[PDB]
Design an enzyme around this catalytic site. Structure first.
Site, mmCIF file in Angstrom:
data_model
loop_
_atom_site.group_PDB
_atom_site.id
_atom_site.type_symbol
_atom_site.label_atom_id
_atom_site.label_comp_id
_atom_site.label_asym_id
_atom_site.label_seq_id
_atom_site.Cartn_x
_atom_site.Cartn_y
_atom_site.Cartn_z
ATOM 1 C CE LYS A 154 -3.704 -0.483 -0.169
ATOM 2 N NZ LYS A 154 -4.510 -0.819 -1.374
ATOM 3 C CE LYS A 180 -3.222 -9.567 -3.906
ATOM 4 N NZ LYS A 180 -3.680 -8.176 -3.678
ATOM 5 C CG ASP A 182 -2.496 -1.643 -6.195
ATOM 6 O OD1 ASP A 182 -3.501 -2.258 -5.787
ATOM 7 O OD2 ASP A 182 -2.106 -0.555 -5.726
ATOM 8 C CD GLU A 183 -5.454 -5.554 -6.846
ATOM 9 O OE1 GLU A 183 -4.319 -6.066 -6.832
ATOM 10 O OE2 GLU A 183 -6.143 -5.375 -5.823
ATOM 11 C CG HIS A 273 -6.382 -10.416 -8.825
ATOM 12 N ND1 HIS A 273 -7.628 -10.128 -9.348
ATOM 13 C CD2 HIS A 273 -6.138 -9.477 -7.887
ATOM 14 C CE1 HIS A 273 -8.119 -9.062 -8.748
ATOM 15 N NE2 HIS A 273 -7.222 -8.643 -7.847
ATOM 16 C CE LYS A 313 -19.303 -14.426 2.183
ATOM 17 N NZ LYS A 313 -20.503 -15.275 1.953
#
Lengths: 447, 179, 447, 447, 447
Positions: A154, A180, A182-183, A273, A313
């Protein structure tokens, strides 16, 4: 149109797929089922000049069900069947093209959702499979008792060569297993794809030299052209990076199958991803389920797969996710409707894909995380507001301490889903970073 | 049936109608499109360009163009009349007289002929409006200019947006905009 | 989270995309709009240690508008804005990955539908564009006054090498312009991809030898691997076929952009079948619109595009279909909400894609077709039950006569939406095949 | 010929170029302006047979302005406009070919000088750009606070393989950042291009081993044949040299862009030495300006580019150079006639090129240099008679000491244009080499 | 600085180049000549530590002349020399880089113009030469008695694939030898770059089929990069086109030498358009002369070369063009100052380049044309307002008829500079197209 429920003893190969089906009113139910069966192959008995001469009866996709949904108005699953020869070896693209290419939205029914798929043993064996097994990935990484660790660097952008490189070094060194990028950190003109690869590669290299553990970063090779993809992959193998990440659904199955066959050819692990996987799978009446993409993406092989998590959930949803989560690691799976597995599927020793969960999860869910995914998974961090004031490398160290204590306390046999908080809290007694992690959140949701 | 009728095509003699009357009559000899241009000298693209406004001139003999809209319109509006191929008999001469009373750059009515085509489709004309290119353009801003919100992209239709001096209704409806 | 409507003065490049938006109740509306804006880039102001030092304010995806839907409960249109640098040159995959990869289904709103997209002049110019223009395709095919003709070879399967190719020769020698494979006649073990290409190729060549018109067949090259795709394309160029067909959405944009750049490299026309489209674009509250795929597929270039037809559809749907027909022939398009074009988009001389309609249409629908698509389109036949009881080549001849008479009667200026049935009646007075076509159906749907 | 000043409302893309214009007498002024506008595209409306059927009015290069030069006899500035479609993506060669290929010397005017050119944002985004940014170059070189250092190896010739490479060794060991050879050094039969590359490469590698700073010296690759050029340039890439130098204007943009595309395809810096830029930009009435050329170089994609210096030049000339100096670091530039920016130009995040000055400058010019180029530049030495009577290594060391001590003056806040001589005097109090540098020249040109 | 006029006995190899030289006042003349000699190589005796150990005296560029211009204030040509070893084999780029790269504008003199160049026999026999000789080009084209014919297509744009392909038919078929497009025709959005080639190629092939004469079109391959250039040029050879055209001065000598070596490798003739020439060669005090480019472009080989014409310019300038016009055809040329040849030059059987003139000359100058260029040239048409009011193919025939008759007239022995108008008058007595050509202009400029 006489292909309603003729039993016919559904067979070994048979491609037994299912559907969540909802007509528009003024439509009788099994005629619309045979409409699905006709639209799947050789539409609506199209009249030709050879009909009277030769009977076209070898490639019909006849169905064999009409069961209403328990607790739903106008909703009943229909089991279809497509024999063998409608599908090419090697392709998932041909699978999706044959099954659902035009069947949806044929202006008779209200809605339709491809819910499940049975793949036969005689079609499973002819695909590539994943580049490496869970076994083989652990063999290449020497990670034998615990789930693997990961965080996202980040911020997303404005965080160039050194800025993006140095940051990765700290985060990685702190003690994680993976990081990983950033997409959408493809080759954008503030941050060219060249030097990010060079600095991350060097970053990982230096990290290993110090820590003595095999390390790796998920390098993004989402490319416009396939030649760009092969070029970036060949540079990823040139400097010796153990794994590359590549989104499947926006890049496409042809690129993904080609890249997977490449990863088999050079022995590099492969991350996927799940990008834009909600634009198809979210609504409960129309689309395809992410489970079908999960089986298809186990076939067009990948070694990792984002699958999301269960935090607060609904019970059936959590079980549903679990159902599909256990429909990949196992190679012989029974059929539960409540977990959402409608079919008993064999895999014939395909060494299935590791799942990995990535949501807004801090360390408080660490005890619950392992309690769910057991041991065979990767765990992510860094999604929402979980910026560690102390630092990213102290955060990574606290994460490593947290997972080690959680795995060992699960080995202790004490309820990790009951005494979770106490374990972590007690653990932080010597690690101040984990004490800060205790300070920043809490887990008084339930027992 | 044709003796030496291609020499005028060969010498480039005639204004524009002596080309089109000739090519249309000549097309029923037996030769295809790649034979009349494989000698005389006529590119297929243009071979069709004047192979229609022939029939648009057959179409515009509804009203007599009153000797002020046929003087320099003998061999002009090539692409102008070529592009109009979806107009209503009631507007083909009405769009051409607009194009010869407005005098813009030769291909400009391709955009009015689409909104005009949409105007002659809605089951019923709008009341206090009439079927014409001048009104269509004026009514084109209703589902565009009005739909707009900002003075940047809403003040550019102060000239081309209206200019329908052939419909008071549009002029009476384009008054509450000086806001 | 303050990005609600700060009026922004929306700019030249700006990537102004829109959204059909529906919250779950208990959610204030503009906070969810800024949630879309944050989820599009640099999620929810993720706290870092440098946020006190440096302000991350150059790459904020920034919402600016809110407007409720006219005639709808709990829905509005949000206008997003993403400045320039979030996108790679050359890629449509990066466009979709950046805009909608995770934004959907973020468990706050009920539903969301990517409705529209504005592409700037400074991003349009850096893509490949289509391999050939409408102009250039007519230049290569010498078809200058009429829409192009096409039928689908029936039946779908069991109709092997000599069977398929010589049926193509019959149905194309009847007088058509093109014939296509459907989506799923890839290399399946009853019909290997080799000999179908060879026989269809020889059929095209002998048919050009007889008729004297340039002819072509839409060859399917939907492939598992990209190397298989390039191999089948290179064989398609080796024997000189003018056009190949390739589905876009199941094969993927990386394969499609690569294949389009190949078609530019060798000068072959390019057809795209919109398979698997109805999964994503059908429901009116969740998905993306086919219009956005149409603009993106004009960018990742193609020379043809299935777009479907309007036969007895709803008025606003027909207007929307005309809307995104107009989004791919014109290069300067205004903004109509009722046609579904929310943005005024330039294309900077990209020579846009031919549409082609394929539904259950017989020859009596033909006077509607030239009424709707004008001249710049291709028209298909052979979908449902329209097996000509005389023959396929008599059917093709009747089709050719029908389109020639329809184009000439539109040139007559008779308002052909009104008199087109009588036009065909005087047209069939010498052609018995067209008289049979008059016999087999009718046109008294409406005036 | 009516294109004189029809006010045009000059637009967004528009390619708004300008001209310093001087007629021959007996010529009215705006007719010659429209003559420029016609000669730029579709000359003097060449009579045709399709002129009476179609109006050629979409691609007219269109003049719109006239303004006499302040303080000049018989000269004015004409503003030309060329809309979009006259230019290829990727090419600077097509830009120069379209704008000035035949327009000059058309035997009506006395003289003409292409003075300026405004590139649009929808055409400058489709080029390659530089291989690396100023940012990215600092990232690869870890030089973060000071301008970079450089000297030219003296003498020019007769200074063969061990001589040249070992001669650069001392210079590089001294403390410089770079050491590039002069243009005339290519593969000449007293000094073959092979062994110079080998020895300079080994010198760089051993110097990195000793000093611990990333080092690199320009390696001229100016080649006869592209294949040969790439071949010799390939060697550098295999020997891991960080940067290559290549003159642009005699080698050609065609061979430049191609090499520039291969420069960013391997991740190597780029050194463009403006060779032969005085016989095309010197005279103030005829030619093209260096500013225009500079812009083209930025579009090509070079990292560094010789921009000369200001030592005792004229005030407007100094400002002029400064005006164009920023026309390649800033990405949003306003318009000053006295500086050079004739029309405001955007660059849309192209990471512009480092300038570097090379004139007859000794160390006393150094307090002017950091006064002028700020921080983002490279500084050269070794041009004229500045042979250090102690040695090249000591001399280089002295230079570094000066700049290093100076850069401190800039951060100090002493107005270093006034006190820079005394700064160097207190700097040489411990370094005897810098004391010799104090001894050999002086700074009393002016305050 | 003692290199003033030491008489040198100027030698065999010696690279004896000359200069038109103009100082600024306050400068003694031979010191500035030795300044040119020093700036050409090893500038101004640059001090060093090995100057008191070794004398650098093997590579000096001393001059040997200083004669004032007959009829000029402050203007005397200098005769500098450069021995051998300053130049690479294969390169013209190294020639220009060594001679004039920095020598101009060295802020001492007012102006300087590179006027002439002597190429030694031991350095002019190591270059590629042209791809084909005048002999060999006539051998490949079977054009043995007359100059070749050619007319540029008009319009310059908006005249796309079939419209720009069918228009070339008439121009070529009408009877010409060649047709060539203008520089501004490369890959544009309004007209692809491969499409045009295909159409053009076909036209040539069908025109060869009808007329029985070998025909050709000058295809433009001015390309952005080198790969693209070679790629597009490679297609031409695959299609089988006898000649390609390529501008030299904006594309660059590296691209041009590479393309010439390619044309030798595949046996294709080569045309060169002298675009962007008037930037450099127009002013009579500053630049280089087009003659030097002509010799350098004979070296970096080409088979054709635009050279202009002497329609009705000054006699002094007319002779100048002739002087440089015989600096290619002949291979042993003497030295005339009133012609350009400053020093006698051998070529050692380089089969020199055909010139071709292109100005606003119609068929009225045809008689004079044959009078000037003899037989070994190509003649152009179509520049200004000479649109034939009958047609382009009638114009072509007229052109050929004129030159043909004109050639015969010259062969007859009538002194065709005197009677050429009457020659055309008796020639048009049966050809009506030539009679129209008689009608449209006139020849009473002079006897």
């Amino acid at each position: 149109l006489t292909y309603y429920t003729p039993d016919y003893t559904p067979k070994d190969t048979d491609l037994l797929a299912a559907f969540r089906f909802s007509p528009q009113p003024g439509v009788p139910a099994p005629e619309a089922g045979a409409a699905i069966a006709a639209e799947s192959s050789t539409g609506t008995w199209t009249t030709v000049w050879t009909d009277l001469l030769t009977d076209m009866d070898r490639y019909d996709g006849k169905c064999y069900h009409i069961e209403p949904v328990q607790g739903e108005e106008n909703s009943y699953f229909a089991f279809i069947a497509d024999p063998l020869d409608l599908f090419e070896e090697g392709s998932v693209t041909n699978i999706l093209t044959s099954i659902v290419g035009n069947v949806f939205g044929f202006k008779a029914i209200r809605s339709l959702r491809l819910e499940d798929i049975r793949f036969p043993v005689a079609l499973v064996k002819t695909f590539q499979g994943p580049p490496h097994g869970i076994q083989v990935e652990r063999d290449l990484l020497n990670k034998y008792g615990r789930p693997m660790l990961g965080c996202t660097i980040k911020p997303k952008l404005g965080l160039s060569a050194k800025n993006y490189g140095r940051a990765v070094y700290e985060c990685l060194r702190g003690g994680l297993d993976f990081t990983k990028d950033d997409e959408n950190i493809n080759s954008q003109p503030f941050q060219r794809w060249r030097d990010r690869f060079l600095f991350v590669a060097d970053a990982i290299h230096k990290s290993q030299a110090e820590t003595g553990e095999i390390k790796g970063h998920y390098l993004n090779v989402t490319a416009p052209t396939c030649e760009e993809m092969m070029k970036r992959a060949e540079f990823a193998k040139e400097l010796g990076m153990p794994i590359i990440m590549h989104d499947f659904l926006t890049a496409g199955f042809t690129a993904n199958t080609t890249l997977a066959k490449w990863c088999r050819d050079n022995g590099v692990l492969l991350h996927i991803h799940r990008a834009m996987h909600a634009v198809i799978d979210r609504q409960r009446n129309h689309g395809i389920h992410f489970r079908v993409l999960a089986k298809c993406l186990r076939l067009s092989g990948g070694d990792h797969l984002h699958s999301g998590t269960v935090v607060g959930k609904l019970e059936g949803d959590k079980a549903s996710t679990l159902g599909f989560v256990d429909l990949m690691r196992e190679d012989h799976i029974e059929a539960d409707r409540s977990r959402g597995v409608f079919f008993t599927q064999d895999w014939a020793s395909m060494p299935g894909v590791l799942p990995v969960a990535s949501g807004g999860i801090h360390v408080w869910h660490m005890p619950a995380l392992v309690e769910i995914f057991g041991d065979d998974s990767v765990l992510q961090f860094g999604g929402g507001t979980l910026g560690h004031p102390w630092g990213n490398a102290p955060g990574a160290t606290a994460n490593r301490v947290a997972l080690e204590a959680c795995v060992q306390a699960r080995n202790e046999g004490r309820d990790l889903y009951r005494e979770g908080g106490d374990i972590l809290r007690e653990a932080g007694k010597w690690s101040p970073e984990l004490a800060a992690a205790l300070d920043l959140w809490k887990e008084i949701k339930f027992e | 049936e044709r003796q030496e009728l291609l020499g005028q095509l060969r010498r480039k003699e005639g204004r524009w109608l002596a080309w089109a009357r000739a090519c249309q009559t000549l097309l029923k000899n037996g030769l295809n499109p790649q034979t009349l241009f494989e000698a005389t000298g006529f590119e297929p693209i243009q071979q069709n360009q004047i192979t229609v406004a022939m029939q648009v001139y057959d179409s515009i003999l509804r009203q007599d163009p009153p000797a002020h809209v046929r003087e320099t319109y003998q061999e002009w509006g090539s692409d102008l009349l070529y592009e109009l191929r979806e107009l209503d008999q009631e507007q083909r001469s009405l769009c051409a007289q607009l194009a010869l009373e407005r005098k813009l750059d030769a291909d400009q009515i391709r955009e009015v002929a689409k909104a005009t085509k949409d105007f002659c489709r809605l089951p019923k004309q709008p009341e206090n409006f009439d079927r014409h290119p001048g009104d269509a353009v004026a009514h084109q801003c209703w589902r565009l200019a009005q739909e707009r919100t900002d003075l940047t992209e809403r003040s550019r239709l102060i000239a081309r947006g209206l200019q329908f001096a052939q419909s008071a209704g549009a002029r009476a409806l384009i008054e509450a905009l000086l806001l």
